[PDB]
């Protein structure tokens, strides 16, 4: 599988996470010290994708947060953290 | 990596890196107020004139390649 | 090749299945073929395929022409089996081709509208959004004149449905091209002499413009009102009704600004109040109710006194829409500055509670919510006791819906205001009614629980005389056969524990706690979690020494409950054990605590973050209670023995112990566990150090020196996992002690991290780059630039690649700082390279 | 030993880089929001008393690069949009009840620091408050859409991209297009062609363009609509009102020209800037505007444009059928060069000068009634010919208030010269003819000021008489003698042209001297200089002696010393450079003037001048002889009856020496780019040997040795460092690297450092004075308990009370080097500014009460 980050200009949408990855950093897969709130671009939050998990793409239950390490290194300024698969379409789940 | 202008590769020339760092320095002078203050005092020019001269230098800071 | 095709796609892409050859078919057929290919790559393609196909279909939209492009797109857009994201992609390609096509779509505008307009009435909100977006792009591409010429013939239609459709679409084009562009057309149509259908349609256009644009219509509110005002005195009743409704929409969209714009509408509405009846009367009332919150205090009082006669008259109206309208209008009036509380108490409250607060209203859910919110808003101004006293005696009604209604109303009133306005008689009435409504519950109405809790917490210490009665009722409901009633009683205990403790009635609370102990071990997980939470609240509010049952007998009962699979039971049991460990550790032996800790290690890998946080907190409490030594020895034995799947729990527990009892009681033993020549336990010690430093952050500022030799031994050990985990340790250290004076030890560890940059394996070079960025943060970009410059320009190409990768990381990291760290490069015969501004001397 | 410092700003920065006016209170009163650099201030001028009161001051812990106000349709209170170094856009609303700035919105988009491609430098707003554009210097440009909600609260949207690679932005401004789609005018220039042509033709042919970015609200996207190449490069833009209040369009200010442009069939209307009649500056020198101001009225509107000389011109436009006809310019007045001008209602004008004090004048007369010549663009003129006007004192403005400003502080010395128990701060600051030496006493700071001729560079106190020896140097300035010579040559040229009237005009021009302090000193000639030596009594500020210098001589060092070969007689050496043309740096030679201080330090007599190869930038007395830093060479000089002899020298300093300080048998060389270098000189053998350097390079500006093995230095980039030689360091070794034991970022370029004690009996502290006008102190810690307490206070303030403009405090204080053992007291003292809930929570975290923490902070304040 070929997965990558969106890295588009994020907006006012709040990123969310499902029950499997509650309170986990989307960038470095860390579970310690959630710091800043995750923002995603409008394309990844439009329509049936609103409030959907950033990692897998399922029903999100909590707010996604960066960790303190990513905040200090300013890895939250890079762009939309939405994981996207280059080997699948919009209809694929 | 055209997202970040100053980034480089194994084929980045000395002239490219130096004009990049010169433009970085000029924009930092534009940003930090006390740097512009020092430059306007030493050169004895109005802050507007110093900013205009820096923006003019921003075209070819190091000259033609 | 070609992407996958769904069944329903065949109908739209059958010609692409056969691999025909070009030039054999007509050149017009070759256009359709490429349009099919582009649309198939867009609809069912990968992101790169979609981007390439979008760029291709935009860069050739003029060559393709509007005709075949839309003749292929529109059937696909209205496929009954089209996904929502496919619809969004089609909307986007339509927007792009409309921008490229521009005036070429004028002959096709109508052909598009008859397709798009249904989306504006679809139940899907995003479908309506996409329809509006398509119409906006079409109006921007075709022009205002084309849209007016194409949509005008449907204005005077006698369908009343296509009229609403055309009004909505005209509002969309108005929001697309701006109100001033469509102002002359509206001023002309709203004064049409041909028929009243045109006036009705224009006024509906104004209404939909308001509804769609909201606060954006404030600049042109005067123009809209002056164009629409003449319809209030028209001969047709439908046009007067739509005029009033559009006035209400304009007022709602302009809240709370722009009352002077409605100056020419106040007296017409005021007279129509006394003149009209029926649906027109309701529309006038709605417009007035939405207009009132825009007026000054004195004029609000004047207008409200003028319209309140007819408001009270229509209080007893048979039309349910009329009742909803007048209820909203009352809520709007009594929520504005100017309507005195005494005036509402005198003239509004008696008829309000006479005609509205009737049993029937408690059956319909919409009327239920509307009347509850209106009554709470009334209490928010006229006072809590003035409203509660009129509905408190209804707490003992025979209809359960009416009891639920009055209970929710009292709950919201007392939660928004309080109990300082309540006298003694009203307090007794509240207590009696709450007890009667709670004892007479058919189901488990959560509103009753919320009301009981709210009223108890609002009374505070005033509930003490009734505490024996409430405790007896909670006892009787706790023994109930039904489990949900037991759960509701436990939640009521959890919500009233603090109030019962403040009232100084510890014996009743101890009896409740011993009954909860007796009911512990309930099979139903939700009831067990609720009684665990109740026990937690009781233990937290009461003293551990005088707590009945004793903690000595309570904690061993809680020990096996952690093995339950239900997350609620897990969280509640963990929280109770943590409270016990915090304020009552003296009543428990160290062996029980050790067994609790060993049964608590699994819950560190739970998916629920709340369970993880609770487990961490309770483990920290137990470590503070006992001490680090015994638990740390057992945890190191576990780390040495257990398999790699359960070692992360041990690592997290080690970090918790090191953070709670200071790391100088943990780092020596952890580093000592490295001397054994087994590789797996060495990797485990390295991972423990990594997570420990990442967890303690700033606290590890006094421990980098101690661990530096272990790292420098692992940094150059001829093992890949060793160097990887050691680089992870260095990264977490650097990010943790960032800005606390560790530049010496970190600059030392940099010299051991740097030789590992020329490594081929990816998993280790990733950790090396992470350590390098952490060290850039901790030591500063200057040292990193100093180490990069020596290899930035090297004859070796791979060396240049690696050093430029590191330089790119540093440059993205801190670009503004590097300006003060760049070295000197003297000028040559061709270029100027020295920055002379930085050489100035004052 | 261990240096744990506590930073406290005693005097906030008084300079101003941005100033806007608006109804930030929500009432009819007009207030002024200014930026001091890292400080956001809110001032209110009372129209009754005509005085400016300061209502709010907040340390934002960032670098404000762009500041502007706006209002939404139907609103009654202007908001505040701030562009910082944070990569975040911030919108705030002043609340007069709580007297604070409430962060309404904060949206992230980029990285921190004054970066070249990350927006923050430029800020434009749509005049109807519907959208705001934030732009960088290069490519990146973002547009946010603003609206209201049900409760009339500001709502911001997602950003819309408007980037364009290889595009340098000179200035952005929002265009008043009524209630149409918002538009932003940009002065851009594409450099892609320049870097691909090694002949240089592309750079000389690439011209500046004026482009218009239109934000379509229906399509909800930003598009680059129009783009027109410009004749000459403009330096900034002015928004002329539009809609129903004006004809819309834009005003471009360039070199010696101002143009009006507008999209559509509207032609371009340009007009040359009127030059001063009988101007004394170089004819080749151009004339541009430095700032602008716009005043709208129910009737008409106008603009105020200030030139480089300080002349304010009032500008009006003629319009016929919503189309401009001409640009009317008229000389309004002349005040010092301002960074921003605010034309408030109720007839007032606030002028925030770039350097020196700021002023508030009252507008008495608009000026139209006067017979003074009004210039227009329709007047015929030869291409080279420009208009002429006569400057005169204030006619339409009357000064009603003056705000003191210590910026820019070039040097400072703390000493007791008034023979009081508490020392006074003698601060040589100011720029050009507005420079001054000010005495500061506390007992906030009370100040007195004595004017000076030019910009001071350095000054020393005479120990035997406490009198000050000032050196005042300015670049491209004219000496008094050359000024009179230029006037005489102009008068000679004037008569060669009715001849009786010409001689009378020339005599009247000769007999009239415009005060340089208010009209700006006529300074020109890129290679010229002007230096003056002065003696001053510090108690009454009376000039005891004054020595003018040669036209091409620039003073850069000064010292008072006693020589061993002579008796206790006092000598004064002044290092001077000849024909210093900087950028590109080129110089002829240097001289050292030697004078004999006579009459207990009241006048000096010329002895001899000693020539030398390059610039003598530092002069430090070394017991018997003296030490001088000429270029990259450090020499010892002995006093001879004829000149100054070089008994020994060292030439291994890597770059230019900027400062030299000696203690015992050691000497500390301050390289311009490299850090400090340690040199030891044995009395025997007579040779200076380098025995220690640094591991980090530092652009040093000043220094102050704290003890034998330590030194403290100030950076050009607003940093303070403290380094120390390692233990067991001998002087007969070649290679030693100094350990850095303290690093800190102040946010303002510090130019004076001195270890002293303000109040007698208090703890010794380290006082610094910066170029931005601020004065701060560093106090060392005594016990580890207090250090840990204040460290926890700083940690909790960083998280619970973050900086105002989105910056990270720990990152800001680590701008160029990571923080090392410094606690920011300006952040800690903000504990009293938080809400009671957060104060109670943080105090319970530290096991004490909010009043106890306030009392601890006040104890530190009173200790000093
Ligand atoms: C997004 C995912 O990657 C999807 C999936 C299916 O990936 C395989 O599931 C992932 C879930 C992983 C979990 C739940 C890992 C458990 C780990 O447990 C160890 C013991 C660690 N525990 C902690 O760090 C616990 C507490 C910390 C200190 O504090 C807090 C507040 O969390 C790490 C993991 C939680 C999912 O991520
Ligand atoms: Zn995205
Ligand atoms: Zn997920
Ligand atoms: Zn992270």
Residue numbers in the entry:
A (entry chain D): 6 to 98
B (entry chain B): 15 to 79
C (entry chain C): 463 to 1304
D (entry chain A): -1 to 441, 773 to 826, 831 to 1197
Publication text:
Splicing modulators alter the splicing patterns in cells by binding to the U2 snRNP (small nuclear ribonucleoprotein)—a complex chaperoning the selection of branch and 3′ splice sites.
Strikingly, SSA’s epoxide group resides close to C26-PHF5A—one of the four cysteine residues of PHF5A’s Znf1 zinc cluster. The electron density is continuous between C26-PHF5A and the epoxide group, while absent between C26-PHF5A and Znf1’s zinc ion, indicating an intermolecular covalent bond between SSA and C26-PHF5A. Although C26-PHF5A is no longer within coordination distance from the zinc ion, the anomalous difference density shows that the metal is not ejected from PHF5A upon covalent modification of Znf1. In turn, a water molecule appears to occupy the freed zinc coordination shell in the trigonal crystal form. The resulting thiolate anion attacks and opens the epoxy ring to form a thioether bond, while K29-PHF5A contributes to stabilizing the leaving group.
